[PDB]
Design a protein around this ligand. Structure first.
Ligand SMILES: [Mg+2]
Ligand SMILES: [Mg+2]
Ligand SMILES: [Mg+2]
Ligand SMILES: [Mg+2]
Ligand SMILES: [Mg+2]
Ligand SMILES: [Mg+2]
Ligand SMILES: [Mg+2]
Ligand SMILES: [Mg+2]
Ligand SMILES: [Mg+2]
Ligand SMILES: [Mg+2]
Ligand SMILES: [Mg+2]
Ligand SMILES: [Mg+2]
Ligand SMILES: [Mg+2]
Ligand SMILES: [Mg+2]
Ligand SMILES: [Mg+2]
Ligand SMILES: [Mg+2]
Ligand SMILES: [Mg+2]
Ligand SMILES: [Mg+2]
Ligand SMILES: [Mg+2]
Ligand SMILES: [Mg+2]
Ligand SMILES: [Mg+2]
Ligand SMILES: [Mg+2]
Ligand SMILES: [Mg+2]
Ligand SMILES: [Mg+2]
Ligand SMILES: [Mg+2]
Ligand SMILES: [Mg+2]
Ligand SMILES: [Mg+2]
Ligand SMILES: [Mg+2]
Ligand SMILES: [Mg+2]
Ligand SMILES: [Mg+2]
Ligand SMILES: [Mg+2]
Ligand SMILES: [Mg+2]
Ligand SMILES: [Mg+2]
Ligand SMILES: [Mg+2]
Ligand SMILES: [Mg+2]
Ligand SMILES: [Mg+2]
Ligand SMILES: [Mg+2]
Ligand SMILES: [Mg+2]
Ligand SMILES: [Mg+2]
Ligand SMILES: [Mg+2]
Ligand SMILES: [Mg+2]
Ligand SMILES: [Mg+2]
Ligand SMILES: [Mg+2]
Ligand SMILES: [Mg+2]
Ligand SMILES: [Mg+2]
Ligand SMILES: [Mg+2]
Ligand SMILES: [Mg+2]
Ligand SMILES: [Mg+2]
Ligand SMILES: [Mg+2]
Ligand SMILES: [Mg+2]
Ligand SMILES: [Mg+2]
Ligand SMILES: [Mg+2]
Ligand SMILES: [Mg+2]
Ligand SMILES: [Mg+2]
Ligand SMILES: [Mg+2]
Ligand SMILES: [Mg+2]
Ligand SMILES: [Mg+2]
Ligand SMILES: [Mg+2]
Ligand SMILES: [Mg+2]
Ligand SMILES: [Mg+2]
Ligand SMILES: [Mg+2]
Ligand SMILES: [Mg+2]
Ligand SMILES: [Mg+2]
Ligand SMILES: [Mg+2]
Ligand SMILES: [Mg+2]
Ligand SMILES: [Mg+2]
Ligand SMILES: [Mg+2]
Ligand SMILES: [Mg+2]
Ligand SMILES: [Mg+2]
Ligand SMILES: [Mg+2]
Ligand SMILES: [Mg+2]
Ligand SMILES: [Mg+2]
Ligand SMILES: [Mg+2]
Ligand SMILES: [Mg+2]
Ligand SMILES: [Mg+2]
Ligand SMILES: [Mg+2]
Ligand SMILES: [Mg+2]
Ligand SMILES: [Mg+2]
Ligand SMILES: [Mg+2]
Ligand SMILES: [Mg+2]
Ligand SMILES: [Mg+2]
Ligand SMILES: [Mg+2]
Ligand SMILES: [Mg+2]
Ligand SMILES: [Mg+2]
Ligand SMILES: [Mg+2]
Ligand SMILES: [Mg+2]
Ligand SMILES: [Mg+2]
Ligand SMILES: [Mg+2]
Ligand SMILES: [Mg+2]
Ligand SMILES: [Mg+2]
Ligand SMILES: [Mg+2]
Ligand SMILES: [Mg+2]
Ligand SMILES: [Mg+2]
Ligand SMILES: [Mg+2]
Ligand SMILES: [Mg+2]
Ligand SMILES: [Mg+2]
Ligand SMILES: [Zn+2]
Lengths: 87, 126, 119, 70, 206, 50
RNA sequence: AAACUUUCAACAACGGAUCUCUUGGUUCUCGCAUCGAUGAAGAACGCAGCGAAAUGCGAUACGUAAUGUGAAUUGCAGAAUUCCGUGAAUCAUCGAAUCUUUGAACGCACAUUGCGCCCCUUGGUAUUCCAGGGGGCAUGCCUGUUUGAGCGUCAUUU
RNA sequence: CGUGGAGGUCAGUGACGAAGCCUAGACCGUAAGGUCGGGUCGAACGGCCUCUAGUGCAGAUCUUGGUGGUAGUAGCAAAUAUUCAAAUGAGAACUUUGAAGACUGAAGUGGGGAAAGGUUCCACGUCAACAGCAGUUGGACGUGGGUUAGUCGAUCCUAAGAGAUGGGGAAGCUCCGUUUCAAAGGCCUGAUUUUAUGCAGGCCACCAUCGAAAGGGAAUCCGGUUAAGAUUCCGGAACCUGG
RNA sequence: AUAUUGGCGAGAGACCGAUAGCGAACAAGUACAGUGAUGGAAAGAUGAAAAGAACUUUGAAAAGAGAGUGAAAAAGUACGUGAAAUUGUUGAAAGGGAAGGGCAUUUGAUCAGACA
């Protein structure tokens, strides 16, 4: 009975969706995400799990703000406006 | 040969820069030389094709033919001539795509800016 | 068409608020039509236009506040320079260039001389 | 459309962020009409539908082809 | 150096009717089950992966470096050798070929080529140019696209325009006596370059 | 189901919208290279794990 | 003698070797020093006339402002006034903005689009009830401000 | 002898056809192999002297991919059962309708729900794949439509339990404690007729919060209506809470 | 003065050449598996140009046969070349419980050379 008839009773989730990473790794009774670590202020990760790091580092998403720091740096963090010219 | 440290002979880097050039850059790669006539006339060898220019095909199968440029199809690195087309089996008609380096410019469409360009290259006008 | 910002910036505060309403009415009516017509690109330009009006309105109100804070300690955090978080807390040049009483006396009396070898 | 001819009701797609109060008033203001009550539901494509019933003074049909549709 | 090895694959051990290489575990994807790490596996690591700490340069005793370049210089006289080496010098008056010092002062390519022609290079210059071919390798797409012979080697005592006037002509190389390089003196380790010495250069030799 | 949280309905909605064939006009664009929709999903061939 | 089997060849299948390609990978080397409470990295959901991706963006949503260029964009439709011009563009540059719901994530919660409090303002006959608009309220710690506690403790009242 | 790549050279071959591939046609070598012809093909490639190695396969229950004999074979046999005719359609053992024969037998093969699914619901179109015969049918494919609440649930309460906070451990990630060795907080109105909310009484010391779609719990019913919703819409008639 | 398998920007190689090179040359950390931590692929090439096959004909259709385009369909969105295993047809041959091989010659088929 340990095989398939037991599998018939598999209809309750141990994890739902994680707010911080959206992964369906938020263990309900434990109230913590098995992937990202939420609600722990820090983010879960480990040096023995490189591929996982790779799967989640900076650059694997939008970079809504960091994107632009280097242009900005390149120009000395100029402020103001650009004037005019001709042609 | 190359002599500067900010220029690359690398073939890989070249082809990339070609094929992924932005529209603004393709404007200049799409340059046709002027006609022997126009070249004396303006003292200046080539210009980036613009639309309503008048042009002569001097290469390939349509060699000899002439017309007004109808679009610079920058996306395709190709220029269509309003007058040079494929008629079909179903008699529908279709632009042939031509390459600026295989044309010669025969009348320029002129702007303030076009003239400004020609001057900037140290050329002269009529 | 599409309204131009350099012409918006000459309207009064209150003119722009109404052109914004005018635009919004149009966009309302445009979407009503959109679902009768097979295509309706005109809508794009009316809704870029709304952007532009808002852009110009926020622009002017900002420019106002900016000035009436210009040249005092303490101005709203979003008119302060952004720079970088660290840059933001680096020592000011005055703070950095700060030199000890004892030290400037030294710098003064014995400063690195310019000299040369030959004769 | 039928609710509009038969029920004196105006069906609208409405901001998800908005409640029956905000739907009610805005229909009232954008359309010069009087609203009886406002039923709402979330569509299965993540948009909100408002079943707006006008009062008996108004005639949704008339009112709908003076916003422009039909 | 991480390549071949980015798996958590294990052997399945024996008794499963199947070889014993490690195998990608898990499932649902076609990669799982597959041979891992081994140098005979698709996507394995290679055998004895190449390492950057291989020895690339070589040290030759300075003295013996000189025996060779000296040797190489002496052969640029011996005209049989020069002939043997490619190099079209039946036309050329005598060997060593020594041209006037006025050469070092030539600013302009076309004049440099004219000079060269007048002293007998012509036929050798033409042999480059006639010999440009597409490299047969995969070389042709690692920045080695074309191939061609070597021309004459003009040696000066003082560059007063001569290196730039010759810089753009196919196959033609320059050198200042004071240096003087085995790679150029005996291209491909075959003796007998065709050298054109300026007088100034030729006497500094001693 | 049958009584869901709004978060789930939302996902549910987003996944209905994604469940459509490739828009055939894309097939015509210069350099276009997408043959068909290669991320299509079916309710009885792949469960969506919420 | 056929059929059958086997062998070879031609043509046709199956299959995707081989050869030639390469906007990728690898390794070397040179220059440089810039994430975040001024809300980062990451998540979710959305946004195009006609998109499911990838790429971009954020209800101002494949973009707004500015600036340089100087006439395209293109799969179709479109605008059409935008072409000797404050001016085309799925262009480049980018200094100004917008930036949903979230995240160290900060009013409390969160398998909830769940539940307070304070200020300004508008509507409902309203300081108190309801509703709309805007602005706010985490924690440790530093300097300072104000209001305080303790026979810890000084002096001073008559 | 043979292969990738490098220096030199033959001013080597080549779109008037490189390379590759095919060929019980030719020729050289004892051999590794080398050369030609013919067919096919379409953009590059070779000889010689040297340099260099990720350099030669039949096996490793070798790795990946492809292919066979087996073989039109095992099989497609549990759940009593099917039949006539019309209609439609290129096509009907299998679709639709009519007729007949049976079945489940209300401990249901009926009428609804919880978990779980997530659009499968409904309509129109429609057969390439899929439903181990079939297909005109479908939970398939294409395009659309559809889920209406003061009273139904959530939301509120507490249960086992979970878990912030003054604190105490721990190098630290963190662990312990939940009223615990803490200066832990808000209500009723009085006081105001500068004036809006400061102080004048007194109380209350209960010390977070999360945790039930079966526990506790304010209140709605009947008739009608849709392709597809209904204690939610329409009609009528109530009731609860707050103001 | 030193370090640097990260970040930004550059120049390179006696490096790999689509089963190789990073896992990923592509909508690749995707699709897919797993309650979870994690695991994690396959997959590039018509042609200069779509000129992507009008039109007729047989068919219910898919398609076939013509025609047409093209330097070529012996390039037809199954698309450059297109090996081998393995398959169909055609031609030839052999076969009394395997086949294949060695020396030798008959027979059939086939072919080089030398002669002048
Ligand atoms: Mg299982
Ligand atoms: Mg559990
Ligand atoms: Mg915990
Ligand atoms: Mg937290
Ligand atoms: Mg320059
Ligand atoms: Mg120019
Ligand atoms: Mg072209
Ligand atoms: Mg614009
Ligand atoms: Mg500051
Ligand atoms: Mg009516
Ligand atoms: Mg509702
Ligand atoms: Mg290793
Ligand atoms: Mg086995
Ligand atoms: Mg590998
Ligand atoms: Mg060569
Ligand atoms: Mg080769
Ligand atoms: Mg299932
Ligand atoms: Mg007989
Ligand atoms: Mg054979
Ligand atoms: Mg054959
Ligand atoms: Mg290859
Ligand atoms: Mg090519
Ligand atoms: Mg490289
Ligand atoms: Mg360098
Ligand atoms: Mg992270
Ligand atoms: Mg796009
Ligand atoms: Mg557009
Ligand atoms: Mg301007
Ligand atoms: Mg841009
Ligand atoms: Mg906004
Ligand atoms: Mg919180
Ligand atoms: Mg909220
Ligand atoms: Mg607010
Ligand atoms: Mg203090
Ligand atoms: Mg004090
Ligand atoms: Mg050898
Ligand atoms: Mg070799
Ligand atoms: Mg190699
Ligand atoms: Mg022969
Ligand atoms: Mg041939
Ligand atoms: Mg050939
Ligand atoms: Mg070719
Ligand atoms: Mg060798
Ligand atoms: Mg090897
Ligand atoms: Mg062997
Ligand atoms: Mg083998
Ligand atoms: Mg074997
Ligand atoms: Mg062996
Ligand atoms: Mg094998
Ligand atoms: Mg197999
Ligand atoms: Mg059969
Ligand atoms: Mg049988
Ligand atoms: Mg039976
Ligand atoms: Mg059986
Ligand atoms: Mg039957
Ligand atoms: Mg019975
Ligand atoms: Mg019974
Ligand atoms: Mg049944
Ligand atoms: Mg039901
Ligand atoms: Mg389901
Ligand atoms: Mg159905
Ligand atoms: Mg069929
Ligand atoms: Mg099925
Ligand atoms: Mg079947
Ligand atoms: Mg069938
Ligand atoms: Mg459907
Ligand atoms: Mg649908
Ligand atoms: Mg109730
Ligand atoms: Mg509630
Ligand atoms: Mg605790
Ligand atoms: Mg609770
Ligand atoms: Mg309950
Ligand atoms: Mg209950
Ligand atoms: Mg009823
Ligand atoms: Mg209805
Ligand atoms: Mg129903
Ligand atoms: Mg009612
Ligand atoms: Mg009543
Ligand atoms: Mg009452
Ligand atoms: Mg590096
Ligand atoms: Mg370098
Ligand atoms: Mg690979
Ligand atoms: Mg290799
Ligand atoms: Mg791989
Ligand atoms: Mg590629
Ligand atoms: Mg796949
Ligand atoms: Mg291919
Ligand atoms: Mg192509
Ligand atoms: Mg045909
Ligand atoms: Mg040809
Ligand atoms: Mg061919
Ligand atoms: Mg071909
Ligand atoms: Mg075709
Ligand atoms: Mg190809
Ligand atoms: Mg082929
Ligand atoms: Mg024999
Ligand atoms: Zn998480």
């Amino acid at each position: 009975g340990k095989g398939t008839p037991s599998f018939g009773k598999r209809h309750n989730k141990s994890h739902t969706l994680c707010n911080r990473c959206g992964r369906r790794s938020f263990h309900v009774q434990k109230k913590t995400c098995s992937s990202c670590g939420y609600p722990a202020a820090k983010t879960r990760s480990y040096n023995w799990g490189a591929k996982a790091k790779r799967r989640h580092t900076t650059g694997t998403g939008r970079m809504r703000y960091l994107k632009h720091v280097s242009r900005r740096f390149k120009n000395g963090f100029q402020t103001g406006s650009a004037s005019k010219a001709s042609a | 040969a190359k002599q500067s440290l900010d220029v690359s002979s690398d073939r890989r880097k070249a082809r990339k820069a070609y094929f992924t050039a932005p529209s603004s850059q393709r404007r200049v790669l799409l340059s046709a030389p002027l006609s022997k006539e126009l070249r004396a006339q303006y003292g200046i060898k080539a210009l980036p094709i613009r639309r309503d220019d008048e042009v002569l095909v001097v290469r390939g199968s349509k060699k000899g033919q002439e017309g007004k440029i109808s679009s610079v199809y920058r996306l395709k690195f190709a220029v269509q001539v309003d007058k040079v087309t494929k008629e079909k089996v179903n008699g529908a008609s279709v632009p042939i795509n031509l390459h600026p380096s295989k044309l010669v410019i025969t009348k320029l469409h002129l702007d303030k800016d076009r003239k400004a360009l020609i001057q900037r290259k140290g050329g002269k006008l009529e | 068409a599409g309204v131009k910002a350099y012409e918006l910036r000459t309207k009064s505060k209150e003119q722009l608020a109404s052109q914004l309403v005018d635009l919004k009415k149009e966009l309302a009516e445009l979407k009503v039509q959109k679902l009768s017509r097979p295509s309706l690109p005109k809508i794009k330009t009316v809704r870029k236009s709304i952007a532009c009006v808002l852009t110009v309105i926020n622009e002017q109100q900002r420019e106002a506040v900016r000035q009436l804070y210009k040249g005092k300690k303490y101005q709203p955090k979003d008119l302060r320079a952004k720079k970088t978080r660290a840059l933001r807390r680096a020592l000011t040049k005055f703070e950095a260039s700060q030199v000890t009483e004892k030290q400037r006396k030294k710098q003064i009396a014995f400063p690195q001389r310019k000299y040369a070898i030959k004769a | 459309m039928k609710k509009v001819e038969d029920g004196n009701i105006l069906v609208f797609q409405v901001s998800m962020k908005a409640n029956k109060y905000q739907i009610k008033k805005a229909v009232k203001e954008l359309y010069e009409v009087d609203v009886l009550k406002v039923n709402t539901l979330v569509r299965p494509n993540g948009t909100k539908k408002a079943y707006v019933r006008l009062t008996a003074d108004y005639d949704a049909l008339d009112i709908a082809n003076r916003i422009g549709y039909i | 150096e991480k390549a071949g090895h980015q798996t958590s694959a294990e052997s399945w051990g024996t008794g499963r009717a199947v070889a014993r290489i490690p195998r990608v575990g898990g499932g649902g994807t076609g990669r799982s089950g597959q041979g891992a790490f081994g140098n005979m596996c698709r996507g394995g690591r290679m055998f004895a992966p190449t390492k950057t700490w291989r020895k690339w340069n070589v040290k030759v005793n300075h003295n013996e470096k000189r025996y060779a370049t000296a040797s190489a210089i002496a052969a640029t006289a011996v005209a049989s050798l020069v002939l043997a080496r490619g190099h079209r010098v039946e036309k050329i008056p005598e060997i060593p070929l020594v041209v006037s010092t006025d050469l070092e002062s030539i600013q302009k390519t076309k004049e440099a080529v004219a000079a060269l022609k007048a002293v007998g290079a012509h036929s050798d210059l033409l042999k480059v140019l006639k010999s440009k071919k597409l490299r047969a390798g995969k070389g042709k797409y690692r920045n080695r696209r074309w191939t061609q012979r070597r021309g004459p080697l003009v040696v000066y005592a003082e560059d007063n325009g001569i290196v730039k006037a010759l810089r753009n002509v196919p196959g033609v190389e320059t050198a200042n006596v004071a240096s003087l390089n085995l790679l150029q003196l005996a291209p491909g380790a075959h003796l007998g370059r065709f050298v054109i010495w300026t007088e100034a250069a030729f006497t500094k030799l001693d | 189901a049958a009584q869901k949280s709004f978060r789930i309905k939302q996902k549910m909605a987003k996944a209905k919208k994604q469940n459509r064939p490739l828009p055939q006009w894309i097939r015509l664009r210069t350099n276009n290279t997408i043959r068909y929709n290669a991320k299509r999903r079916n309710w009885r061939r792949t469960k969506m794990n919420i």
